[PDB]
Structure 1
Amino acid sequence: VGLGERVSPTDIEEGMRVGVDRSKYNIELPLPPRIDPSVTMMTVEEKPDVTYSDVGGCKDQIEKLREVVELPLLSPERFATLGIDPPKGILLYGPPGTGKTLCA
């Protein structure tokens, strides 16, 4: 098919759902890209109160959390001087119900 009613090509994104003609097959009106909007917004949880007091015990994994997240943010000057890469990606893993989310 080709270009919409009079809509810019940039607005006609990849994966974006579109209404087309019943029999003359051509874009008319853009439609919401899927239904990722609104569903997702339910799922989002924002900065909970959860602190290490509410985490039962402390282990080495938590000490390895602290380095990655806390240290480059408070002072990226330290990471430069060392000339190491600054950690900013982490993979957390183990058995479920460990409390992986609680520490995050």
Structure 2
Amino acid sequence: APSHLWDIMGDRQRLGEEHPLQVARCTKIIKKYVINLKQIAKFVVGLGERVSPTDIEEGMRVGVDRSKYNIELPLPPRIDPSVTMMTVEEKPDVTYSDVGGCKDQIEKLREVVELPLLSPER
């Protein structure tokens, strides 16, 4: 349904060349940034226009431009993990009172796990 609510911005963030960056990981920091491409190619670049000197860190994916290599936006590290991205769930089924009876198994777990998370100052 929102067909026209997007393409209006298609004349700025799309036609111009900004986003199409080559994802690569930085190795050595000289404060000259040695960055290795996913194609197994190494080069050296500097900072960007909006790039802060404290944002670039060792062992982090840093997107660089394909034509003229330069640092534009940083990327979250460890893009390789895939299967572990599906291990995160939300809103489980079994509640706290679904366990039949009140025994020592319930009281011992809540003090070593639930207690420090809910009351870290206790």
TM-score bin (small chain): 0.3 to 0.5
Q: Give the TM-score normalised by structure 1.
A: 0.40
Q: Which has the higher strand share?
A: 2
Q: Which has the higher helix share?
A: 1
